[PDB]
């Protein structure tokens, strides 16, 4: 906006305090620059009525939709703190919840269902997915409702999510089972080889992941029982035996180069 120089950008000098031209040094503009309330408790007793009650208190109207969003965010925070999620996933969950709530398509379902569905979406989109059963453990909602709500969120908000692979769950399962790094690497190699070689058509990745856990567990000094595997994975012991008896042939090929048998 420099005179005598049409179409000239002005360098803003936050130290010298001016707006300055890189052809002639003129200055345009002499200097540079740079909803509610709460009513608390009364201090003096002069505000109290004959029955007390202080006569002056916060009405806290703040619309209905803002109240719904605030309760939903409280539910998201107290849900994600239980499995100890980092706050980036919480903020992404809040972003998805606000987009869904302003999309105005899922009024017919409990806000808590949309909340846990957005938690699942945000856990998926960071490359650290949780299982549906892990979300169901820290939520008051059945697996059917969260599945249907997840199906409606992906249909409505028009986004694509990456398909889960077995290797994402391996670190959480081994670490929560307190297994060392060699067990981690061996189990991940077993899971990825079993996926790629095609022993398991249409099997869920959670079952073969826990099967790889059982592989790496029943080959070293430390050993884990079927019940512990089902406790940490959520898959039933029958499903572990199904995956065991179907993965057991061609065992040395699935193992890595060295494991110290």
């Amino acid at each position: 906006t420099c005179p005598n120089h049409p179409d000239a950008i002005l360098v803003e000098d936050y130290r010298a305090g001016d707006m300055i031209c890189p052809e002639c040094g003129l200055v345009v503009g002499d200097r540079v620059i740079d909803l509610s309330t709460m009513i608390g408790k009364g201090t003096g007793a002069a505000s109290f009525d004959e029955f007390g009650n202080s006569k002056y208190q916060n009405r806290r109207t703040m619309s209905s939709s803002d109240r719904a969003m605030m309760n939903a965010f409280k539910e998201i925070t107290t849900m994600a703190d239980r499995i100890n999620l980092p706050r980036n996933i919480v903020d992404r969950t809040n972003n998805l919840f606000k987009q869904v709530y302003e999309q105005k398509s899922l009024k017919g379902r409990a806000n808590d269902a949309i909340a846990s569905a957005c938690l699942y979406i945000a856990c998926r989109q960071e490359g650290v997915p949780r299982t549906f059963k892990e979300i169901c453990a820290v939520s008051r909602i059945s697996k059917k409702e969260i599945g249907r709500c997840f199906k409606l969120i992906l249909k409505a908000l028009e986004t694509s999510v990456d398909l889960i692979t077995t290797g994402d769950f391996m670190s959480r399962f081994c670490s929560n089972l307190c297994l060392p790094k060699q067990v981690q690497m061996a189990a991940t190699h077993i899971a990825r080889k079993a996926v790629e070689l095609d022993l398991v058509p249409g099997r869920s990745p959670i079952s073969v992941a826990a099967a790889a856990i059982y592989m790496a567990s029943q080959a070293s000094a430390e050993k884990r029982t079927q019940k512990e595997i089902g406790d940490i994975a959520g898959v039933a012991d029958v499903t572990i035996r199904q995956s065991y008896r179907l993965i057991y042939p061609r065992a040395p090929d699935l193992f890595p180069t060295d494991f110290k048998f």
Partner: protein, 48 residues
């Protein structure tokens, strides 16, 4: 005079009371919000 010190320039040249002052500046990528992300990249004058 009046609580002041004369110092040896040659001594200071030889390491007398020489010291360093580490300052650390901390910045995080706060991608909270709808589309208010701030990715770490070299800012060219074309965009930004």
């Amino acid at each position: 005079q009046e609580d002041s010190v004369i110092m040896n320039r040659s001594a200071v040249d030889r390491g007398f009371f020489r010291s360093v002052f580490y300052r650390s500046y901390k910045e995080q990528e706060s991608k909270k919000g709808f589309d208010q992300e701030e990715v770490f990249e070299k800012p060219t004058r074309e965009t930004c």
